Amino acid sequence: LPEQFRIRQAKRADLLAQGRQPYPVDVPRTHTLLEIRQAYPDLPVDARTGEIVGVTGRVVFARNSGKLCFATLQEGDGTQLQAMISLAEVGQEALDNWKTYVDIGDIVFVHGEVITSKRGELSVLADSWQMAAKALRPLPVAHKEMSEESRVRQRYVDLIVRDQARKVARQRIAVMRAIRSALERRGFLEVETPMLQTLAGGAAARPFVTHSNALDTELYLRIAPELFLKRCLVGGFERVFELNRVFRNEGADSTHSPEFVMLETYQAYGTYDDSAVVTRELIQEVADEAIGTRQVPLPDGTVYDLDGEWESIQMYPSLSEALGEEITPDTPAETLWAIADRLGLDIPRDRGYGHGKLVEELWEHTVGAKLWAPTFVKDFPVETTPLTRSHRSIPGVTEKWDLYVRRIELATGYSELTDPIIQRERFEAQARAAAAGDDEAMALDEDFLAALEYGMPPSTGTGMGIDRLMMTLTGLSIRETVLFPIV
Numbered sequence: 001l002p003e004q005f006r007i008r009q010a011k012r013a014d015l016l017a018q019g020r021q022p023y024p025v026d027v028p029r030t031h032t033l034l035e036i037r038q039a040y041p042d043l044p045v046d047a048r049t050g051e052i053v054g055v056t057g058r059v060v061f062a063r064n065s066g067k068l069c070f071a072t073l074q075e076g077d078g079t080q081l082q083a084m085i086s087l088a089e090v091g092q093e094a095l096d097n098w099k100t101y102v103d104i105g106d107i108v109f110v111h112g113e114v115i116t117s118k119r120g121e122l123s124v125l126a127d128s129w130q131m132a133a134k135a136l137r138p139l140p141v142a143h144k145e146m147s148e149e150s151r152v153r154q155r156y157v158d159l160i161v162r163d164q165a166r167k168v169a170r171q172r173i174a175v176m177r178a179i180r181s182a183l184e185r186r187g188f189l190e191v192e193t194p195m196l197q198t199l200a201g202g203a204a205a206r207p208f209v210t211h212s213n214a215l216d217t218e219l220y221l222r223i224a225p226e227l228f229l230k231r232c233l234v235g236g237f238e239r240v241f242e243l244n245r246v247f248r249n250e251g252a253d254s255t256h257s258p259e260f261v262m263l264e265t266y267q268a269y270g271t272y273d274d275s276a277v278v279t280r281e282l283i284q285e286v287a288d289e290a291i292g293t294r295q296v297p298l299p300d301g302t303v304y305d306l307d308g309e310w311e312s313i314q315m316y317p318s319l320s321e322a323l324g325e326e327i328t329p330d331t332p333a334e335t336l337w338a339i340a341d342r343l344g345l346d347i348p349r350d351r352g353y354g355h356g357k358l359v360e361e362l363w364e365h366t367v368g369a370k371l372w373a374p375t376f377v378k379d380f381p382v383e384t385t386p387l388t389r390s391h392r393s394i395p396g397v398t399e400k401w402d403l404y405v406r407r408i409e410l411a412t413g414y415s416e417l418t419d420p421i422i423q424r425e426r427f428e429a430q431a432r433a434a435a436a437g438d439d440e441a442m443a444l445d446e447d448f449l450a451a452l453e454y455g456m457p458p459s460t461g462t463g464m465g466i467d468r469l470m471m472t473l474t475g476l477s478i479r480e481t482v483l484f485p486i487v
């Protein structure tokens, strides 16, 4: 209500004018609420510990009584501790000022003795209090459920009233630190590649376009750091990774956010067989450090098993077994069109899709849509993997694996294409498909090609959406894993 806004304004202006400071520069804070609970786990009722402390906390519940005022204080992590304002300890005016100015939502400083109530509630028997932050907007009423849209628009309020919001936010922080600790112990170095690029590449997505005033030209927010992380391989970096933001200006839904966080690792003198092992162990180690179990709990009550080895299937024979028909890279595109036409699959015909795109959409409808447990699918068509090296022995296939978890693409990994001549052909075929109506096709990068011509060692690289890693570990939506998603 707007009347409650001016009521809290009058309390603030009256407090400020009368010499009291509703927003002081500091308060003699000596203890947190958490260390007081840990220092006194069990205490009998009516106990005077004698420990004189000075604590702070947001008032989330207040109960007025004649000579004794009760108030529940809550600090940042959710730890709670009761405040006791009695006439016998704070005096008359300090008691009356508490009833006059303190409202629910205010951040207050309370100095006193750690005691337990007659009911056994661990409290701080105050002898003097002070306003730390006079709140002008009251917190939502108790158990007034915040809508899903309100939780995003006001995450700061969501972190005060909902314990699930604090746990998920602290879980994401633990995941980001677990990824760094797990990669750094393997010899990987975290590097930084530019987010403002002159030509967006390294993935298949539409970029954000902006204007530079220093260069007087159009720049692009990066969709992937792949092309610049490959420059580090040519430069000498053997084990390198980047864990930061990427911008893909496309549609947003339950699994896509235009601004999101990725992980890209690159390991010299290793193949995609080695990167699939690192990615599996990394995810399993992140689950241990951030959740405490590889059988993670899901919001529906079920438990998802992430431990042990994971199934690895090849894409062409898995589609062959699912169809009951031999499908090879030699299978003509017209055959795959007729197979997709019989299956009722809707694939656009004005986009220049050929053999490679048809096998991908056929595998998803027959194999990918049925997976649930962590499963790798490897050996992809050459047309849909421009930055991936051809297979060492199987013709027509490339050395790329895809990691699906609960019907969600979590990670990918290539045996990196180091041949500059073949890489130029891949770019020519991509720009060929873009001229055929494929807006997702990549563009030829002369600067990246020139970097390859100096010699890039045989290496393997990975990519993983950290936001989808949070969805895998927690089961929450993609917007719930972000503190402030711009929606």
Ligand SMILES: C[C@H]1CCC[C@H](C[C@H]2Cc3cc(O)cc(O)c3C(=O)O2)O1
Residues within 6 Å of the ligand: 205, 248, 249, 250, 255, 256, 257, 258, 259, 260, 262, 263, 409, 410, 411, 412, 463, 464, 465, 467, 468
């Ligand atoms: C870095 C990549 C490679 C591994 C799979 C995963 C795909 C990626 C696609 C993608 C595109 C997009 O526009 C918005 C998004 O949030 C994502 C995402 O989370 O996942 O992450």
Ligand SMILES: N[C@@H](CCCC[NH3+])C(=O)O
Residues within 6 Å of the ligand: 202, 203, 204, 223, 224, 225, 226, 264, 412, 413, 414, 461, 462, 463, 464
């Ligand atoms: N650039 C890839 C991730 C790296 C793949 C391995 N080189 C992507 O955005 O999907």
